[PDB]
């Protein structure tokens, strides 16, 4: 079996700047007879099905952006974006199209890099529908910021939570290149009642101290 | 155009068989070869198996090999793999995609999910929201995935951030989705979170208030 090793498996290039994404192939995939490399190379935006945007090695699909071009030969192949735009933030892969099993590269997640942005921070109490069912979550919401690099911590009552929270972030934004997330702090409706402070601190790159969102129990 | 459309997919116990289909329109189905590739949520492309455009020449990945069969139906515009003796390392979004100089095609994809636990439909409980003010729907404890979740029948599109579900201490899955609107429109304007949990038939549409 022909084994694909992409490099870098994630890259951060900057707004209107060149991506470099590399390709090695285990072994050969020039086909002599029609004197074609059986390269292809695929772009899979979040949430999304996979996108053709080369086959060939070099021959860009119609209707992709002249931005995408494939290189290389034999063994070594070469994926280039130029000018980088937002919605070029996805996870890119190779695959050989030579002999069964057709396999893929294990991809390459493409970030785009724009200016610091800090987060917009919400507080979300539990709903009383949810704490009629015995258990309390509290939200804790981190809009549109960058980079990635995020503090969350959790204070019931001035006491610092661990353990019990949980968090989920977005993918890079198609637009602006942002993140948002969502932290969750669970707990039984019984030791939600125990306590009247519940307070979020936020830590980010983008605000020059820690933001606190908080919400008294019964107000 | 091309559309590729894939279904099938659903909770399997392991051990169990499924069949996938691929309904295929805008196209000369029988002039193309057809392929399935596999992805487990949040990881890489795999790819599973081929047909000719006969069905005469197959092939399939190792890992899948004597457990699967891919099948065409040229008259009836249909891809299938059927799919035996199902394990964990199984789950996975399956695609089907039409072959020309590579893979130029693809479907939106069908997710196979094989597990002994139990299809559970969520609760869904509002964010109530406290310039611009932030509002949404949590969706509570459900297996397996999917849920989606849209605002206002898809009418409210901006500012909209569905979360990527996150598996609880529990082993059910939860995610909230939030809308971030000016503070002036909460009179004025409703805010409705439609969640479709297919898996459980449960479909809730949740008005959000102060
Ligand atoms: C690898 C490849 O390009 N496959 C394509 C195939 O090409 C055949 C087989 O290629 P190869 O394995 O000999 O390298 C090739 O011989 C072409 O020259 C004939 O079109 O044509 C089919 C359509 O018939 C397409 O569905 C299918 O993606
Ligand atoms: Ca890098
Ligand atoms: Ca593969």
Not at chain 1, 36 to 50: D, S, V
Not at chain 1, 134 to 141: E, F, K, P, Q, Y
Not at chain 2, 21 to 41: E, K, L, T, Y
Not at chain 2, 96 to 113: E, F, H, K, N, S
């Amino acid at each position: 079996d022909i084994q694909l090793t992409q490099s870098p498996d994630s890259l951060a290039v900057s707004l209107g700047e060149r991506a470099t994404i590399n390709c090695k192939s285990s072994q050969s995939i020039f086909r002599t007879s029609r004197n074609k490399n059986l390269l292809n190379w695929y772009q899979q935006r979040p949430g999304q099905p996979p996108r053709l945007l080369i086959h060939w090695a070099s021959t860009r699909k119609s209707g992709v952006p002249d931005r995408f071009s494939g290189s290389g030969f034999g063994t070594d192949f070469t994926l280039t974006i130029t000018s980088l735009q937002a919605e070029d933030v996805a996870i890119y892969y190779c695959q050989q199209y030579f002999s069964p099993p057709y396999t893929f590269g294990q991809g390459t997640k493409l970030e785009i890099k724009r200016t610091v942005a800090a987060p917009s921070v919400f507080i979300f109490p539990p709903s009383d529908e949810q704490l009629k069912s015995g258990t309390a979550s509290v939200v804790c919401l981190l809009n549109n910021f960058y980079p990635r690099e995020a503090k969350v911590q959790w204070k019931v009552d001035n006491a610092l939570q661990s353990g019990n929270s949980q968090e989920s972030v977005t993918e890079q934004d198609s637009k602006d290149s942002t993140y948002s997330l969502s932290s969750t702090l669970t707990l039984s409706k019984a030791d939600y009642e125990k306590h009247k402070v519940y307070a979020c601190e936020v830590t980010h790159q983008g605000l020059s101290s820690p933001v606190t969102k908080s919400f008294n129990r019964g107000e | 155009e091309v559309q590729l459309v894939e279904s099938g997919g659903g909770l399997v116990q392991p051990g169990g068989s499924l069949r996938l289909s691929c309904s295929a329109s805008g196209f000369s189905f029988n002039s193309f070869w057809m392929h399935w590739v596999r992805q487990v949520p949040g990881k890489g492309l795999v790819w599973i198996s081929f047909t000719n455009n006969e069905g005469t020449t197959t092939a399939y990945a190792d890992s899948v090999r004597g457990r699967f069969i891919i099948s065409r139906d040229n008259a009836k515009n249909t891809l299938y793999l059927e799919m035996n003796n199902l394990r964990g390392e199984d789950t996975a979004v399956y695609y089907c995609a039409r072959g020309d100089g590579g893979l130029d095609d693809w479907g939106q994809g069908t997710l196979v999910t094989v597990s002994s636990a139990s299809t559970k439909g969520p609760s869904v409980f509002p964010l109530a929201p406290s310039g611009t003010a932030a509002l949404g729907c949590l969706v509570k404890d459900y297996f397996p995935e999917p849920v989606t979740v849209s605002w206002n029948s898809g009418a409210l599109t901006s500012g909209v951030h569905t979360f990527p579900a996150v598996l609880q201490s529990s082993g059910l899955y939860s995610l909230s989705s939030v809308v971030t609107v000016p503070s002036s429109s909460l009179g004025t304007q409703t805010y409705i979170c439609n969640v479709n949990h297919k898996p459980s038939n449960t479909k809730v549409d949740k008005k959000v208030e102060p």
